[PDB]
Amino acid sequence: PKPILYYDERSPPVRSCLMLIKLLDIDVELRFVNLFKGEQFQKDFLALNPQHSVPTLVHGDLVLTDSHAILIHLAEKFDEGGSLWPQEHAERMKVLNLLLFECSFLFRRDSDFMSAIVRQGFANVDVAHHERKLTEAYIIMERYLENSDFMAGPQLTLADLSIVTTLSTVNLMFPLSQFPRLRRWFTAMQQLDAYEANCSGLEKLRQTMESVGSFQFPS
């Protein structure tokens, strides 16, 4: 059977999966789970995925509850021979390492910041604190890109798909003005046909956050 993707396109990791699906022409059944209504806590979804996490992919009996597993699974199933998930071991480990940086560092700090706006309203958020946290991710990422067209090397990989969606999300608030490599890379990512899958959800997130947080992002 085809994969089923439980999604809310406002979430960056969801958009990373949407980008890969568009890049690889994968036929997937989308099922919307409204994160801002807490539908990930519905009894049937909790039974499927007690982590109540989105995206979730059901492919046959396989239930993937993390976007980085979904990206790797879809690349191995639908992009054999591709560069997104390289065949060479060292290159693949570099991509894997960056996917985990996105999980544990970039996305974690983005989600901490954006979740704080939702729960408390933008006025109750220590913006300077989250600016420091997320600028540190910018700094690390700028150094990753030294003499490297893409995040993990000279070729587009899953690391770029995973990072670009979250970067575009953090960038709603914190500009890339001071990071020339990051800006150049982000601009290049925006020229890929597959990046169009990021656009709708990013704008929906901007509108939702500005409403629930009672503010405007800078812009």
Question: How many CA within 13 A on the CB side of residue 161?
Answer: 33
Contact with ligand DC1 (CB under 6 A) among 7, 10, 20, 116? 10
Show the binding pattern over residues 196-215: x = contacts ligand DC1 (CB under 6 A), - = does not: ---------x----------
Strand partners for 6: 31, 56
CB of 83: closest distance to ligand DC1 in angstroms?
Answer: 27
H-helix or E-strand spanning residue 57:
strand 56-59
Check: CB of residue 31 under 8 Å from CB of residue 6.
yes
Tell which positions 167-186 bind ligand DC1, by CB under 6 A.
169
Check: CB of residue 9 under 8 Å from CB of residue 200.
yes
> Stretches 63-71, 111-119, 124-132, 141-149: which one binds ligand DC1 (CB under 6 A)?
111-119
Closest CA to 167 of 193, 191, 143, 190: 190
Check: CB of residue 186 under 8 Å from CB of residue 125.
no
Q: Which does 197 bind (CB under 5 to 8 A by kind): ligand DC1, a second copy, none?
A: none
CB of 200: closest distance to a second copy in angstroms?
Answer: 25
Q: Which does 114 bind (CB under 5 to 8 A by kind): ligand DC1, a second copy, none?
A: ligand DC1
Q: What percentage of the chain's residues is helix, strand, coil (to nearest 5)? A: 60, 10, 30
**Binding-site ranges for a second copy (CB under 8 A):** 50-51, 60-66, 68-69, 72-73, 76-77, 89-90, 93-94, 96-97, 100-101, 103-105, 108, 139-140, 143
- Interface residue list for ligand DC1 (CB under 6 A): 10-12, 35, 110-111, 114-115, 169, 205
